[PDB]
Design a protein around this ligand. Sequence first.
Ligand SMILES: *[C@@H]1O[C@H](CO)[C@@H](O[C@@H]2O[C@H](CO)[C@@H](O[C@@H]3O[C@H](CO[C@H]4O[C@H](CO)[C@@H](O)[C@H](O)[C@@H]4O)[C@@H](O)[C@H](O[C@H]4O[C@H](CO)[C@@H](O)[C@H](O)[C@@H]4O)[C@@H]3O)[C@H](O)[C@H]2NC(C)=O)[C@H](O)[C@H]1NC(C)=O
Ligand SMILES: *[C@@H]1O[C@H](CO)[C@@H](O[C@@H]2O[C@H](CO)[C@@H](O[C@@H]3O[C@H](CO[C@H]4O[C@H](CO)[C@@H](O)[C@H](O)[C@@H]4O)[C@@H](O)[C@H](O[C@H]4O[C@H](CO)[C@@H](O)[C@H](O)[C@@H]4O)[C@@H]3O)[C@H](O)[C@H]2NC(C)=O)[C@H](O)[C@H]1NC(C)=O
Ligand SMILES: *[C@@H]1O[C@H](CO)[C@@H](O[C@@H]2O[C@H](CO)[C@@H](O)[C@H](O)[C@H]2NC(C)=O)[C@H](O)[C@H]1NC(C)=O
Ligand SMILES: *[C@@H]1O[C@H](CO)[C@@H](O[C@@H]2O[C@H](CO)[C@@H](O)[C@H](O)[C@H]2NC(C)=O)[C@H](O)[C@H]1NC(C)=O
Ligand SMILES: *[C@@H]1O[C@H](CO)[C@@H](O)[C@H](O)[C@H]1NC(C)=O
Ligand SMILES: *[C@@H]1O[C@H](CO)[C@@H](O)[C@H](O)[C@H]1NC(C)=O
Ligand SMILES: *[C@@H]1O[C@H](CO)[C@@H](O)[C@H](O)[C@H]1NC(C)=O
Ligand SMILES: *[C@@H]1O[C@H](CO)[C@@H](O)[C@H](O)[C@H]1NC(C)=O
Lengths: 48, 243, 25, 270
Amino acid sequence: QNAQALNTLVKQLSSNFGAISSVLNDILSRLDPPEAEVQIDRLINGRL
Amino acid sequence: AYTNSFTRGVYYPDKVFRSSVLHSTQDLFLPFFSNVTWFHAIHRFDNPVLPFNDGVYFASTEKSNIIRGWIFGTTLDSKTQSLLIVNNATNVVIKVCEFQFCNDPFLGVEFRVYSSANNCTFEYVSFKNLREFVFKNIDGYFKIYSKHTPINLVRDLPQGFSALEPLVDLPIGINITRFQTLLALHAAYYVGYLQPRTFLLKYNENGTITDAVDCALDPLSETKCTLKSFTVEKGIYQTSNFR
Amino acid sequence: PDPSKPSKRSAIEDLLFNKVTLQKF
Amino acid sequence: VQPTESIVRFPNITNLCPFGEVFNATRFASVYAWNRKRISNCVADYSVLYNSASFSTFKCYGVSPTKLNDLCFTNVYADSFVIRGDEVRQIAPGQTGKIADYNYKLPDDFTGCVIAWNSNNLDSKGNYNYLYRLFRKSNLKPFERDIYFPLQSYGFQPTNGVGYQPYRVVVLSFELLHAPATVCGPKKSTNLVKNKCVNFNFNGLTGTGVLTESNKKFLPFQQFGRDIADTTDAVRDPQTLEILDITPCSFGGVSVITPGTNTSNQVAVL
Ligand SMILES: *[C@@H]1O[C@H](CO)[C@@H](O[C@@H]2O[C@H](CO)[C@@H](O[C@@H]3O[C@H](CO[C@H]4O[C@H](CO)[C@@H](O)[C@H](O)[C@@H]4O)[C@@H](O)[C@H](O[C@H]4O[C@H](CO)[C@@H](O)[C@H](O)[C@@H]4O)[C@@H]3O)[C@H](O)[C@H]2NC(C)=O)[C@H](O)[C@H]1NC(C)=O
Ligand SMILES: *[C@@H]1O[C@H](CO)[C@@H](O[C@@H]2O[C@H](CO)[C@@H](O[C@@H]3O[C@H](CO[C@H]4O[C@H](CO)[C@@H](O)[C@H](O)[C@@H]4O)[C@@H](O)[C@H](O[C@H]4O[C@H](CO)[C@@H](O)[C@H](O)[C@@H]4O)[C@@H]3O)[C@H](O)[C@H]2NC(C)=O)[C@H](O)[C@H]1NC(C)=O
Ligand SMILES: *[C@@H]1O[C@H](CO)[C@@H](O[C@@H]2O[C@H](CO)[C@@H](O)[C@H](O)[C@H]2NC(C)=O)[C@H](O)[C@H]1NC(C)=O
Ligand SMILES: *[C@@H]1O[C@H](CO)[C@@H](O[C@@H]2O[C@H](CO)[C@@H](O)[C@H](O)[C@H]2NC(C)=O)[C@H](O)[C@H]1NC(C)=O
Ligand SMILES: *[C@@H]1O[C@H](CO)[C@@H](O)[C@H](O)[C@H]1NC(C)=O
Ligand SMILES: *[C@@H]1O[C@H](CO)[C@@H](O)[C@H](O)[C@H]1NC(C)=O
Ligand SMILES: *[C@@H]1O[C@H](CO)[C@@H](O)[C@H](O)[C@H]1NC(C)=O
Ligand SMILES: *[C@@H]1O[C@H](CO)[C@@H](O)[C@H](O)[C@H]1NC(C)=O
């Protein structure tokens, strides 16, 4: 049970949550701050 | 004629190395245990223009190299583009353009393949004899996978597992809806069709694919795909929902 | 406890401890 | 552990991209039958388009224009045509209209750029050689080129309204496929540093970690390695085609051991 819980927690790190990508470096290297903030907010909510 | 496909037509779906893991993927695959079309192009000859659909699994067993290429295109005339590939004795002539093809196209061994060619845009140069191919046209890319295996069977398909590897990638954008094979005249082969399906792929420690599971073949396969394993213990398991 | 082994375990404890098996960044 | 250096590697490219074949061209196709060009295997500099004089529309979707000189792409598609001054707005995702629905549907999930230029001094005659399609039984799909009569000729004439003058517009579509990058842009590559926490740039993969010599047996077509949790584990060298092993920098928690303050003021750290 403990191993399964940890595995699920780790796998939830590759989800999109409605953003354009699941990588912070990608969106930081592609977009400008004003909209990067919105999509980073979406990712933050999912991870929380 | 019809025969059994067994477990043939598995190819590497990505350029990512993996080892000692069971990975689930979705792509266009040849469904397991399907009834594959068996053809005698010339026995008397019937070598027609077959639809391409979403892809073609091509496999044949030959020694005399009677098969030398294929014709890809929608109209197969000089009106619009068409792809022509020829397996030379020294290279490959990969070239696509309008080709007012002949009613009985074949390499003159002169060019009895086609009558006229013009307006060309691209050109590329680069018995236990079982040859296997996978041809796809996605996003305008023409992808070719292949694998050569010593199988002593001509009139059927063998049993076992072997994974096809990428051979050529072509950024063309050509519109293809039909295809036809080239023959050399001074010829038996098979044609399958790929479908959207999900598979469970087993990777050896060296990155070699060694086993697979068709997730929609039967209830036991659904159970195996759900539990992420190739062995199932005793008991009852809930697999899906109906409606 | 078995005095002849580096780990001061009995035989039954040794049997028990061999049946249970078995991301930083 | 903080990183110390940065590692940058780029592929074998010296060719320049043929942007001038379209941007400097003198012949432009009709809006109903567009001209598509494939650009690849070259260095691309977008600062000239960013700094181009007399540019009217320059809007990047999903990328920022200033950060476009540091990215790499599988391929870039350049498409050219001439449009009216008033019809420029229709070339955008989520837009409807005569051209947007009957000439060229720009997809909603499109990534790339759109650039428009006024071409009255070069195309105006009335130049009826440019035709815009007016009738369909259904709206066009994205990237489709379908070629009362459906086609109508443009009134590109001198002294016409600026919203009716011919406009040269180029649609740049950027693609990010699994294939290794072909269009990279100008950047200087360095050598390899081993056994240190460093910053990584093996285009298009970036990250941080520790590089050692990998003994993984990649296949010739194989570029990347991944772990059980779908995490990067190996990379190929863009210039020497060698496998490199990745290990994260060490980290952990810091705790302070202390007796009461009433007795001492010295502590130990774990
Ligand atoms: C996944 O990858 C692993 C490696 O990590 C593979 O395991 C090795 O596979 C190779 C096959 O390519 C094996 O090599 C062969 O081993 C035979 C038996 O080895 C024993 O006997 C020899 C006798 O000298 C001993 O030295 C050895 O230590 C073993 O005790 C050898 O008889 C073979 O030699 C013959 O072929 C070579 C080819 O180069 C000739 O040069 C020789 O002269 C001779 O004719 C050969 O060396 C290797 O043994 C495997 N490793 C282990 C530890 O067993 C997996 O096979 C691979 N799996 C997949 C699916 O890819
Ligand atoms: C085809 O593609 C080429 C490049 O591949 C383009 O060439 C560029 O054209 C632009 C104009 O659109 C140039 O920008 C201008 O450059 C002028 C340079 O003139 C000096 O240098 C030449 C030598 O070539 C001398 O003969 C000349 O006497 C000058 O000493 C500048 O003078 C311009 O500055 C003026 O205009 C700007 C407008 O923004 C004002 O802000 C300034 O204050 C000033 O008044 C201007 O900078 C650019 O330099 C060219 N590049 C190259 C490499 O040649 C073509 O334009 C393009 N053609 C088409 C039709 O698309
Ligand atoms: C098949 O291969 C032969 C070579 O064995 C080709 O003949 C050569 O083709 C090249 C074209 O790349 C020419 O440059 C040479 O001059 C040719 N040599 C001779 C002796 O003819 C032939 O064209 C190939 N044909 C096909 C259909 O693949
Ligand atoms: C791609 O180009 C780079 C140049 O930046 C090559 O690196 C040098 O290539 C020349 C030949 O063009 C060699 O003589 C040098 O010895 C190379 N230097 C180093 C440090 O490697 C690089 O080899 C090229 N890549 C390929 C695959 O050809
Ligand atoms: C395979 O199935 C097809 C129908 O899908 C059938 O026509 C054919 O006879 C079958 N062949 C065999 C060997 O069962
Ligand atoms: C490809 O050709 C067929 C005709 O065989 C046509 O129906 C189809 O619309 C064409 N597709 C494209 C993308 O041109
Ligand atoms: C070649 O294509 C051009 C237009 O691209 C056309 O005008 C010409 O008639 C074509 N000729 C042949 C022989 O196909
Ligand atoms: C130190 O001692 C005083 C009484 O002498 C007490 O009030 C205080 O809480 C003590 N502080 C600590 C850290 O133990």
